[PDB]
Design an enzyme around this catalytic site. Structure first.
Site, PDB file in Angstrom:
ATOM      1  N   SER A 125      26.871  67.632  30.345  1.00 37.50           N
ATOM      2  CA  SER A 125      27.964  67.051  31.096  1.00 37.50           C
ATOM      3  C   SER A 125      27.475  66.703  32.499  1.00 37.50           C
ATOM      4  CB  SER A 125      29.203  67.958  31.096  1.00 37.50           C
ATOM      5  OG  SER A 125      29.095  68.959  32.079  1.00 37.50           O
TER       6      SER A 125
ATOM      7  N   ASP B 144      23.652  72.580  27.669  1.00 28.21           N
ATOM      8  CA  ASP B 144      23.597  73.707  26.733  1.00 28.21           C
ATOM      9  C   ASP B 144      22.643  73.405  25.584  1.00 28.21           C
ATOM     10  OD1 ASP B 144      26.001  75.333  27.905  1.00 28.21           O
ATOM     11  OD2 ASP B 144      26.840  73.354  27.493  1.00 28.21           O
TER      12      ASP B 144
ATOM     13  N   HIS C 108      35.131  78.268  35.820  1.00 33.43           N
ATOM     14  CA  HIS C 108      35.363  77.161  34.896  1.00 33.43           C
ATOM     15  C   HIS C 108      36.861  76.964  34.809  1.00 33.43           C
ATOM     16  CE1 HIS C 108      31.219  77.059  33.653  1.00 33.43           C
ATOM     17  NE2 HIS C 108      31.457  76.338  32.571  1.00 33.43           N
TER      18      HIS C 108
ATOM     19  N   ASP D  22      31.080  81.705  39.257  1.00 33.49           N
ATOM     20  CA  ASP D  22      31.360  80.435  38.631  1.00 33.49           C
ATOM     21  C   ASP D  22      32.809  80.483  38.156  1.00 33.49           C
ATOM     22  OD1 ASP D  22      31.931  78.816  36.331  1.00 33.49           O
ATOM     23  OD2 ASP D  22      29.799  78.416  36.061  1.00 33.49           O
TER      24      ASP D  22
ATOM     25  N   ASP E 293      25.111  69.792  33.629  1.00 35.10           N
ATOM     26  CA  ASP E 293      25.369  71.005  32.867  1.00 35.10           C
ATOM     27  C   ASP E 293      24.810  70.801  31.449  1.00 35.10           C
ATOM     28  OD1 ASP E 293      26.487  73.067  31.342  1.00 35.10           O
ATOM     29  OD2 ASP E 293      28.507  72.825  32.153  1.00 35.10           O
TER      30      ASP E 293
END
Length: 272
Positions: A95, A82, A204, A202, A80
């Protein structure tokens, strides 16, 4: 000696083997087109079962229903990223989730082939159909590096962090070919679409957030290649290779949903 093929006959085939691939779950800044977020979801070596049924009502037409499914939860991975800083090309956050499960994966494909060229050793034609493909993952535990590496830490082991599933559906067109000599048969299909509809979801879990994305009119390329031998005039043992590419709350310019996958299986086809 050679295959026994009658008019109005039909085949049933089953094969077993492996699914691998990689999906991308994307978030862009709709204003600038800059990539903000990207999660890479891997499918490492999921066991699958494939089924295929063909019917030749006429010498020039085949109707075909096929599909595959994972047999159980499989091995995956997720990373992951960003890019929280526009003034930086490198991502600011990464991550990692080695302990990610592929909960399931499946596909079905309903289609017709129209045979345009045909002789003793070669067949060639056009195909068209409808296909849907689904993937589901859960990323658990893992580690995180935020702010260019100044925040680091671990998620609780075994605890679910992000759930993710994708669905691709599309009509498609393509080219189909066959080559036979003696008891050897090679089939090759090339598929294309500009009409892919993609959905993802998704969860989270640690943020209490659910994301939904939807895209339309994206591109797909696929191939199916199998090579086999008729051990009897009606029974073919074969290996099959498959490759699929689906190109790229959350809508429009912000969304990006894609997948590449391939399968390698072996099995038996029988003609009635």
């Amino acid at each position: 000696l050679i295959p026994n093929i009658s008019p109005d006959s039909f085949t049933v085939a089953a094969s077993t083997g492996m699914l691998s691939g990689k999906s991308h779950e994307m978030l862009y800044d709709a204003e600038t087109g800059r990539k903000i977020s990207q999660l890479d979801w891997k499918i490492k070596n999921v066991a699958i079962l494939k089924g295929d049924i063909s019917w030749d009502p006429y010498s020039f037409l085949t109707l075909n229903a096929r599909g595959w499914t994972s047999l159980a939860s499989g091995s995956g991975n997720m990373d992951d990223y960003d890019w929280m800083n526009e003034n930086q090309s490198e991502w600011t956050d990464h991550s990692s989730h080695p302990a990610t499960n592929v909960n399931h994966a499946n596909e079905y494909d309903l289609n017709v082939k129209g045979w345009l060229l045909q002789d003793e050793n070669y067949k060639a034609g056009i195909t068209a159909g409808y296909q849907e493909t689904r993937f589901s993952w859960t990323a658990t535990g893992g580690s995180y590096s935020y702010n260019n590496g100044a925040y680091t830490g671990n998620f609780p082991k075994g605890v679910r962090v992000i759930g993710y599933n994708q669905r691709f559906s599309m009509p498609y067109i393509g080219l189909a070919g066959q080559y036979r000599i003696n008891d050897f048969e090679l089939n090759a299909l090339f598929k294309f679409s500009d009409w892919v509809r993609a959905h993802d979801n998704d969860e989270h879990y640690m943020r209490d957030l659910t994301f939904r994305e939807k895209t339309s009119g994206s591109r797909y390329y696929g191939t199916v290649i199998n090579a086999g031998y008729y051990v009897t005039p009606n029974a073919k043992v074969f290996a099959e290779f498959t490759y699929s590419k689906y190109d790229e709350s959350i809508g429009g310019d912000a969304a990006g949903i894609s997948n590449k996958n391939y399968t390698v299986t072996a099995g038996l086809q029988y003609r009635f």
